[PDB]
Amino acid sequence: KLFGTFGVRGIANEEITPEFALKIGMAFGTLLKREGRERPLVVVGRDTRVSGEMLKDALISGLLSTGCDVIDVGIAPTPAIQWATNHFNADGGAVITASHNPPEYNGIKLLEPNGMGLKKEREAIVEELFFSEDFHRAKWNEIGELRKEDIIKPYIEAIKNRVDVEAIKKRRPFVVVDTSNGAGSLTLPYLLRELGCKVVSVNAHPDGHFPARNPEPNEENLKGFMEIVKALGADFGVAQDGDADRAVFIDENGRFIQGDKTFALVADAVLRENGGGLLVTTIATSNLLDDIAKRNGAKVMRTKVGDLIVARALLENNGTIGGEENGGVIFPDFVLGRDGAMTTAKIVEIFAKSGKKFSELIDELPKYYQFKTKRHVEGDRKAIVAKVAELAEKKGYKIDTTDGTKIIFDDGWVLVRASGTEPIIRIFSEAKSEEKAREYLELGIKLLEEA
Amino acid sequence: KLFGTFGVRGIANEEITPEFALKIGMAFGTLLKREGRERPLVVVGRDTRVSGEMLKDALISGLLSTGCDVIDVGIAPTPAIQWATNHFNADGGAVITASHNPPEYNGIKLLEPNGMGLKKEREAIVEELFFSEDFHRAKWNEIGELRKEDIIKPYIEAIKNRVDVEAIKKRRPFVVVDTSNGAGSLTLPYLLRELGCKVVSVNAHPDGHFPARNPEPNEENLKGFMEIVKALGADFGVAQDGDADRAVFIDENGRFIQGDKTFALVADAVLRENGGGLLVTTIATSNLLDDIAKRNGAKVMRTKVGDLIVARALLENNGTIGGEENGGVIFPDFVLGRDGAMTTAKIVEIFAKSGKKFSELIDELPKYYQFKTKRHVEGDRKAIVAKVAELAEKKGYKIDTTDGTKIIFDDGWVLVRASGTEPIIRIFSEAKSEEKAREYLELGIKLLEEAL
Amino acid sequence: KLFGTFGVRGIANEEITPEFALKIGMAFGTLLKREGRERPLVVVGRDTRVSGEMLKDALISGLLSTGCDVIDVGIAPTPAIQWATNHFNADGGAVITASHNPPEYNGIKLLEPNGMGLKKEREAIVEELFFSEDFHRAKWNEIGELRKEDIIKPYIEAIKNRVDVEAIKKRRPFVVVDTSNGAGSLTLPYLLRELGCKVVSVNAHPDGHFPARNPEPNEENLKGFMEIVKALGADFGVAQDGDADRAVFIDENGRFIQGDKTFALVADAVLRENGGGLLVTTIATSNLLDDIAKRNGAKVMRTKVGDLIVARALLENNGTIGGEENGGVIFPDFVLGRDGAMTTAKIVEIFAKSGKKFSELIDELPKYYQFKTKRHVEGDRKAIVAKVAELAEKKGYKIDTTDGTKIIFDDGWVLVRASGTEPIIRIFSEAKSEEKAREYLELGIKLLEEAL
Amino acid sequence: KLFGTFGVRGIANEEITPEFALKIGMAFGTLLKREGRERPLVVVGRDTRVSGEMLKDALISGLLSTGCDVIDVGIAPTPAIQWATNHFNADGGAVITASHNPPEYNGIKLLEPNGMGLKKEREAIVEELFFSEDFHRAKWNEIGELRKEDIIKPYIEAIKNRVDVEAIKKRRPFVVVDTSNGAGSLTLPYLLRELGCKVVSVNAHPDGHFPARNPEPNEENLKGFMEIVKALGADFGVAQDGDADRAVFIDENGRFIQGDKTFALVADAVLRENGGGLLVTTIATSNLLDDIAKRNGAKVMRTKVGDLIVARALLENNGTIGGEENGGVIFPDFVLGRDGAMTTAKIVEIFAKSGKKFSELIDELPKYYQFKTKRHVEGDRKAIVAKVAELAEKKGYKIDTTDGTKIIFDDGWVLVRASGTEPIIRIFSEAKSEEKAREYLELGIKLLEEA
């Protein structure tokens, strides 16, 4: 009702008002106080968005009224705030951000004591407190205290200690950074410089108006950035979103690298350095990740679509590496969430150690072809998905029903999953050949039209 | 309904909740935006109270949502925040404080562009916006910006440039300052040190829990401070409240000096250095201030009870000096509000230039005797006061009805005024002699009982 | 001896040691105190260089020991620090920067109360105090206080109030910014966004290691930036140095625009808006500036080579616009020094109002051809320049000897000037045609060889 | 030569110039770098003295030039800066303070990685580097970074966790605090309030001009403060010096309590709660501390006069409690140095748990009478002290020569020791009776005149 997949989000000063942020902070503080903790500690941060400071002030005022001490870490990436929540041994965390949404949007993400996003069980309690307003109001002497900490340099140093800095310094990669005027404008260029790379940063000045483009790093938005990467003659380019929790890589030829391929590279390196392990992923990801685990003697766990679900599965099952179809890699031993800067550091280390070119590393992975479409259908799309699953079952097709209808074929698969946010039923198909991937794609639409 | 005489007050986290502060900030920003200004600038400060930071955060978040730029001056005295509001050319000001109230209380005071407390018409507009919640919500690109400034040192320098520092340094008074862990713990001891005094400070560490006593500097609360002043052998002692907008002085003998006498000293010095002027005050203020103006060739304007009314009359009539019966002196040229530190600096300058002792300076003023009493009467207190006025009129008594019933005599007066906050009708009496002061007090009680 | 053309510079921690910065601060404070001021106020800033904070700390410690109050403005452009020195009514200013030098360099620039670089008369006293160490050591109670201020937003707002923001917002230019990880990474992209432009900034994160390139924005260094400007399809691109006192512009086609042409555009706009005035320049600049002033009914004053000389001439003669051959434009009404951000804002306003393309605006100026060469000559280069002047005088050539030997021809000139630092004698030639410009260049080389 | 017993002090801007502080910082950084550490971390703090900011700036600039990272903790007590040096795992520490010296003085104290004052072996190297100026100058890219931390609240919380807060809250003592406008104006009044006391603070506003009095809390300086304690009717009053490393206590009757008696109370409580231990002290300390250890089954180690020697002996021999004749108590497990705030907290806890009055607690200790006199004698006073020792040896008197000449009697002792700072030979005498204290005192003067 209130929170989406990860946090609540909306238009700033229209839906996410200071009253809304204050009530969210009061509900979170009430949840923390009604759990045994007598003086809960909360780490609060925000991205560069212009409405963040007002929303952060309202949230902190709400948290202090409940008797919770608040650590204000200022502007920092969402993975950095998640890391600081565990670093400070806080009882919770809050991020004022809207991820990749346009500048007019903002939102709040509530975190666990370990930095992972808030559990749905606790999110239900937060929603109940928000709508009932049964807030805990601390006495005048029990009102929490606010102190400010800087977490950018400690977080960069924490990332720097998890990679082979000497190899990067020996190679000295030439990396172009596109932080998109987001929270990554304070971490990624400096982290890459300390790794030992030659850094040319694009839109690396923190600006909540996002003068260049929307903070979503997709191919259409990164058309110009790919041209910059081509022109500068760089080894590769990396682009981040507003909260710097995602990293998108561009090769030396200005080609948009899909997130699944960079996730495959990172997972291959991590599993090889771990001698196997567990690879937690979603059901919408490529079979390229399955082959990576097979070549490394590791098991693959396919969860539902969602970064929070992947992080929960990694924590519960002691996973080694995690990621989603968008290519947001999760390093459980570092941060229980997507970390664009850690992914970039790992990719840089892989590039330095390999001795090959970035496009050579990407192309050396097993080849898969994917096609996507989104039929706009209104109504109970879950029933339609179930009916498509039944129709595929009658035709003898092997199917999986974890999140949607995934028809498990021999050389590939076709996935029929309906997004809950909007009345659209997306169809995902993939195979080892161009024709077969489209062949499975038409079958997905064929069954959908039957239902 | 919402605001009192000067700002709204209540128990922190019970009545003055973060929602309340946020709504107050949104209403104030809406008032500022609806008055033509496109990017209003607001100076926001608070006292040392523990609940201040949460309330200040809520208020600032509310102000930024309306499109107003906010200057956060941190912890500072209320007169310092008013001076900063005038100094930064801000379109308004806000103080998170409860003045002298116990530690569990907090409140918000809204200020004018010149630092004076908000006008009653604009306060009514703010109340209407608060209760209707018809707030102006700025777009994402029009959200206000917040910046932090330090005003303690500029405020001290501004006070320091208004007195004869050389005379104070020559005299080097020994002053004991009790800031009561309030916002004055950051200004008054340092200001006194820079004036050239030997400073021994009591409770000068800023603590919002007020471990020593309640921040109200009355004689009962200052019993220990008077003992400290006597023991240390100091020239005089000065005590301030939580927001440091009031100053209470103790002589070298440990005697609680009434605020009217210190106001009389300050007004005498100011009028003498001004060659006369206008002395705006209340109707409860002693005749000691009238004689001060007579000796200085100055006129006296007696307004209703309240420091905001005195400041308004000083601004409108271009007054020279202002004050109330409580002794809160207002310096119109410096700040359009009560300023404890400016009053302390002026008193220190007077003491240094006089060459006498503090008790000698206080006793050289004309002697008046005052008595106070209160009756907890529940009813139409305004009608009772009017009936007392009519009864006094029937008996031939000269009466003034500016605020309550004030019977004027040749040597003194008796005032029958009903408090507007609690069901109590207070009787104020004064005369040039001990016996006559009680005689007027008994007459006031006698007339009150006749009306009752 | 110690100071060069504008400030002292050297390798950090080898020549510009913390001892050197401390001695410089003590000498500057001694100069300020020995000039009558009882508590001088100094505005101290630095660029993004990694050695700046240690040098700034040493300089401030030296300044405080002399009894001078210090305002620390943090990392800011040199023009911003000059603007803050004038804005805070400071008695002096200091900038910890090496301008465009490689990352291993640093230095100190001392400023006047109005923000202009320190006069040579006062620089001689500073050098004498530095070498004699006859510093004024304030007493324990007279040691200056340190204060921190943020000047980025006030400086940006000051630049905004000097251009037609509405026209820029209507046009919405697409500008690519190269701040080169310098002090301009905090001002120029934000200023351009507030003007109303679409801003894509490269190397806009402040980093003192300069990972991309050396902070000098020349064509060889800006080869990649030109490709970025071409690829992005932007209206034009602007590049700044480490201290953000210079601005280099690239047109929509990725062509390196010479600083003289952008200075000509800015001067044309300023003189047209001013209805004439005085154009202060150096003798090494193009005749393009003479035609610009002639078309605007303005006078041209040609000073010696050096930005400090141009600023001094602008201040003394009440000039309207100033600049040098490198294209660093000086706006006397705003800042008495080169300002990259003000120049960028003026250029953006010109582009928005013109309605044409940047290359069209550049090409509409009168066309001149310039050729440059240098000869590494070891000897009395001043005597050789004088001998070249005499040889040209014997041949009937009109010559000006303001700074070097400038042979004033009909359609152009050839300049023979010897660099003070390097043992080289540069030859500058200009004319209205390619062949004739080279013809004048050969004559300059011919005369130099004859003297040699 | 340069450093005294603990640090170097002098008149600010005359002897302790910014050049002197810069050279000290450079020498300390050179010592840290020449000891194998690649990026040493230094915690730098100062007291409220007006000359401390420029001196701190010069010292930090010197430290950064050597390649050492600096944590600037601002204004804090010297024990707080030592605690932060140990807390941040710093490789060293520096305090800009002159302790109890008049306002015109300032100085620098260098600290060990554990917060204890710098060893004499390392102080010699620092002196050699200072005078030879053979400083290590880091490259442009190796220059250290500076960051600021607030240590007041963490230090107060650390002190709170070491005492029984509940007993103090139950008792609610009424304590008068005299911080003398020093660095203790930021910690002690707040610490005592969080303990649960009613706090009336005197001169608790931090001012480097010291408008009230010199920051030395002696009886002549505290004459007015004793009157304040009497007038307010408080349980007891505690006074601190400028750096807040010493605490002087005044009972409810306004009587100046000697530091030895408060040290005896604290040591008794600590040893009782420890079941015995080692009581490290000086040879000038009263026998009152010996009886305290005897009653608690603890041993006494008597070192030479000086707080640094006491701290060194506490660290090397794993001592339990330490202190000197002045009464500066050292808690080895908390801070390897004098801590006025920890001593005040322990005294408050003892007072709360005792149920008696402060004068009753002080008077319950065994009674000793002490007399102090000095003779201004020039020349080699060490030879004179040795000759007095020989004369006492000839007369059959038992003598100890750990520091000066201490004649060990049965009910008391007389000590003949000359301070090296000034040409004065002090005579310390003590006995269990008033008459014998003077009787031993005259014997000390008698033997001194014989030499």
Out of A51, A65, A99, A201, pick the active-site residue.
A99
- Residue D209 carries which side chain, given as an amino acid letter? H
CA-to-CA distance for A193 and C281, rounded, in angstroms?
A: 41
Tell me the two tokens of residue B72.
């956060």
How many Cβ atoms are within 10 Å of C431's Cβ, its own excluded?
Answer: 23
DSSP class per residue in B276-337: S-EEEEETTS-THHHHHHHHHT-EEEEE-SSHHHHHHHHHHTT-SEE--TT---EETTTEEE
CA-to-CA distance for D415 and D399, rounded, in angstroms?
A: 9
Q: Are strands B236-240 and B198-202 parallel, antiparallel or unpaired?
A: unpaired
C243 carries a ligand binding annotation: yes
Give all strands of the β-sheet with D299-303 in edge-to-edge order: D299-303, D278-282, D321-322, D330-331, D335-338
Shortest alpha-carbon distance between residue D359 and chain C (Å): 40
Q: Which residues of C lie closer than 8 Å to B, measured between beta carbons?
A: 145, 147, 150, 153
Catalytic residues of C: 99
φ and ψ of C201, to 5 deg:
-105, 135
Given a contact cutoff of 8 angstroms between Cβ atoms, the answer to whether C311 and C333 are in contact is: no
Give Cα C420 distance to the centre of its chain: 18
Cα diameter, chain B? 71
φ and ψ of B305, to 5 deg:
-70, 125
Given a contact cutoff of 8 angstroms between Cβ atoms, the answer to whether C286 and C263 are in contact is: no
Helices (H), C150-222: 152-160, 165-171, 188-195
φ and ψ of C406, to 5 deg:
-110, 115
CA-to-CA distance for C272 and D100, rounded, in angstroms?
A: 69
Task: Name which of A75, A176, A177, A205 to mutate to probe chain C: the one with the most chain C Cβ atoms within 10 A of its Cβ.
Answer: A205
SS3 category, C279: strand
- Residue C21 carries which side chain, given as an amino acid letter? A
Given a contact cutoff of 8 angstroms between Cβ atoms, the answer to whether A307 and A337 are in contact is: yes
CA-to-CA distance for A92 and A363, rounded, in angstroms?
A: 42
Given a contact cutoff of 8 angstroms between Cβ atoms, the answer to whether A95 and A21 are in contact is: no
Given a contact cutoff of 8 angstroms between Cβ atoms, the answer to whether D256 and D219 are in contact is: yes
Q: Which residues of A lie closer than 8 Å to C, measured between beta carbons?
A: 179, 185-186, 189-190, 192-193, 197-205, 207, 209, 211-212, 224, 227-228, 230-233
CA-to-CA distance for C288 and B127, rounded, in angstroms?
A: 65
Q: Which of C102, C101, C84 is nearest to C93 (CA)?
A: C84
Q: Which of B421, B249, B244 is nearest to B335 (CA)?
A: B244
**Size (chain B), residues:** 452
CA-to-CA distance for A210 and C201, rounded, in angstroms?
A: 11
Through-space distance between the first and last CA atoms of chain B, rounded to whole angstroms: 28
List C-alpha distances in Å: A105 to A10, B394, C171, D94.
5, 72, 26, 48
Given a contact cutoff of 8 angstroms between Cβ atoms, the answer to whether D143 and D328 are in contact is: no
DSSP secondary structure code for residue C404 in this structure: S
Which residue ranges form the domains of chain C, and what is each CATH number?
Answer: 8-150 (3.40.120.10), 154-250 (3.40.120.10), 259-338 (3.40.120.10), 369-451 (3.30.310.50)
SS3 category, A150: coil
Given a contact cutoff of 8 angstroms between Cβ atoms, the answer to whether B251 and B362 are in contact is: yes
Q: Which of D422, D409, D348, D440 is nearest to D164 (CA)?
A: D348
Beta-bridge mates of residue C198: C174
Shortest alpha-carbon distance between residue B56 and chain A (Å): 8
CA-to-CA distance for D433 and D411, rounded, in angstroms?
A: 8
Question: Taking CB atoms and an 8 Å limit, are D150 and A153 in contact across chains?
Answer: no
Given a contact cutoff of 8 angstroms between Cβ atoms, the answer to whether B177 and B202 are in contact is: yes
Tokens 């200085």 locate to: B296
Given a contact cutoff of 8 angstroms between Cβ atoms, the answer to whether D262 and D327 are in contact is: yes
Given a contact cutoff of 8 angstroms between Cβ atoms, the answer to whether A251 and A273 are in contact is: no
Q: Which residues contact C309 (CB under 8 A, 6 or more apart)?
A: C282, C303
Given a contact cutoff of 8 angstroms between Cβ atoms, the answer to whether B290 and B432 are in contact is: no
How many Cβ atoms are within 10 Å of C153's Cβ, its own excluded?
Answer: 14
Please count the residue pairs, one from chain A and one from chain D, whose beta carbons lie less than 8 angstroms apart: 6
What b-and-e string marks burial along D165-175, b requiring 16 or more CB atoms within 10 Å of the CB? Answer: bebbeebebbb
Tell me the two tokens of residue D320.
């339990």
φ and ψ of D43, to 5 deg:
-100, 120
B150 carries a ligand binding annotation: no
List C-alpha distances in Å: D80 to A421, C359, C450, D44, D330.
54, 64, 76, 11, 13
CA-to-CA distance for B159 and B152, rounded, in angstroms?
A: 11
CA-to-CA distance for A374 and A448, rounded, in angstroms?
A: 11
Q: Which residue of D has its CA nearest to A194?
A: D141
Shortest alpha-carbon distance between residue D105 and chain C (Å): 8
A99 carries a ligand binding annotation: yes
Task: Name which of C72, C97, C143 to mutate to probe chain D: the one with the most chain D Cβ atoms within 10 A of its Cβ.
Answer: C143
- Residue D200 carries which side chain, given as an amino acid letter? V
Q: Which residues of D lie closer than 8 Å to C, measured between beta carbons?
A: 11-14, 17-19, 21-22, 26, 50-51, 53-55, 57-58, 60-62, 64-65, 103-104, 106, 137-141, 143-144, 146, 209
Shortest alpha-carbon distance between residue C148 and chain B (Å): 10
Q: Which of B245, B204, B251 is nearest to B77 (CA)?
A: B245
Q: What is the dihedral of CA C328, C330, C335, C341, to 10 degrees?
A: -50
CA-to-CA distance for B96 and B264, rounded, in angstroms?
A: 30
What b-and-e string marks burial along C240-257, b requiring 16 or more CB atoms within 10 Å of the CB? Answer: bbbbbbbbbbbbbebbbb
Q: Which of B375, B407, B374, B402 is nearest to B390 (CA)?
A: B407
How many Cβ atoms are within 10 Å of C166's Cβ, its own excluded?
Answer: 10
Q: Using CB atoms, pick whichever of B205, B224, B230 lies closest to residue D201.
A: B205
Angle C340-354/C259-274 helices, nearest 10 degrees?
A: 70
How many Cβ atoms are within 10 Å of D395's Cβ, its own excluded?
Answer: 12
List C-alpha distances in Å: C317 to C86, C320, D117.
19, 9, 62
CA-to-CA distance for D226 and D249, rounded, in angstroms?
A: 10
Tell me the two tokens of residue D194.
């969080």
- Residue D83 carries which side chain, given as an amino acid letter? W
Beta-bridge mates of residue B107: B9
Burial of D432 (C-beta count, 10 Å sphere; 0-12/13-18/19+): middle
CA-to-CA distance for D369 and B391, rounded, in angstroms?
A: 79
Burial of C275 (C-beta count, 10 Å sphere; 0-12/13-18/19+): exposed
Query: Method used for this model?
Result: cryo-EM
What b-and-e string marks burial along C119-151, b requiring 16 or more CB atoms within 10 Å of the CB? Answer: eeebbebbbebbeeeebbbbebebbbebeebeb
Task: Name which of C33, C47, C51, C61 to mutate to probe chain D: the one with the most chain D Cβ atoms within 10 A of its Cβ.
Answer: C61
CA-to-CA distance for A18 and B66, rounded, in angstroms?
A: 10
Catalytic residues of B: 99
Given a contact cutoff of 8 angstroms between Cβ atoms, the answer to whether D225 and D254 are in contact is: no
CA-to-CA distance for A79 and A95, rounded, in angstroms?
A: 10
Beta-bridge mates of residue D399: D407
Q: Dihedral of CA D48/D51/D57/D61: which sign?
A: negative
Task: Report which secondary-structure segment, H or E, holds D152.
Answer: helix D152-160
Given a contact cutoff of 8 angstroms between Cβ atoms, the answer to whether D177 and A183 are in contact is: no
